[PDB]
Amino acid sequence: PQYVDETISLSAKTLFGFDKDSLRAEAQDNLKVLAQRLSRTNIQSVRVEGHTDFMGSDKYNQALSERRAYVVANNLVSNGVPVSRISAVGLGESQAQMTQVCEAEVAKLGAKVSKAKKREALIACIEPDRRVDVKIRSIV
Numbered sequence: 001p002q003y004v005d006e007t008i009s010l011s012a013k014t015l016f017g018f019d020k021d022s023l024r025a026e027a028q029d030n031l032k033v034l035a036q037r038l039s040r041t042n043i044q045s046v047r048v049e050g051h052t053d054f055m056g057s058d059k060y061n062q063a064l065s066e067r068r069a070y071v072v073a074n075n076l077v078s079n080g081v082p083v084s085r086i087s088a089v090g091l092g093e094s095q096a097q098m099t100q101v102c103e104a105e106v107a108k109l110g111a112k113v114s115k116a117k118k119r120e121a122l123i124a125c126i127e128p129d130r131r132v133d134v135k136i137r138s139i140v
Contacts, residue, residue, distance in 0.1 A: 002140035003044070008034060012068065012130040020064070021071050028075060034134065035079030042139045046086045048073040053129035054093045066090025072132045098126040 015027045023031075038046060050065030050072075066089065073088035102125035106118050114120075 004138050004140055006136045006138070008134040008136070010072070010132050010134070011127065012132065013127065015072065015132060016068070021067055023071060023075060031072065031075045032079045035076045035081050038076070038136065039080045041136075043085060044137045044139060045135075046073075046076065046081055047135040047137075048076070048086070048088045049133045049135060050088070050090045050092075051095060051129055051131050051133065052093050053123075053126035054096050054099050055123065055126070056093065058092060061092030062090045064090070065092050068132055072134065076134070093129065096126075096129040098129045102126045 010027065010030070015023060017024050048069045050067070050069030052061040052065050056064070069088035069090055073086050077083055077086060102122055105125055106121050109118065109121070
């Protein structure tokens with residue numbers, strides 16, 4: 001049949017602030033609204049994917065991202081999304097997009113630039129790779 005694919009990207013910042021896996025209240029509100037919409041949608045699958053930046057081992061990133069994806073998926077289930085169609089996977093840094101652009105951007109500032117602030121800048125620059133994507137496939 002006809003499909004429509006949606007990807008809702010929620011940054012780890014918005015979702016967990018500085019914490020490992022505690023959902024911020026505002027995040028829960030947004031996810032509840034999403035779950036409500038999905039319950040009124042001709043959905044096929046709701047795949048929650050956790051992503052991290054390269055600042056971690058394969059093992060560490062996969063575990064953290066899976067936990068974060070699970071927490072988001074569990075919230076959606078708590079708000080009505082059928083367990084039968086939902087999944088939570090940890091993709092770690094496998095699809096990271098900010099490593100090169102950021103390493104280049106930062107090195108472009110070495111004038112005694114704290115040397116430590118360069119790393120801070122790196123972590124801030126690669127923020128887009130720290131997030132959870134909710135991928136929904138529905139029938140048109």
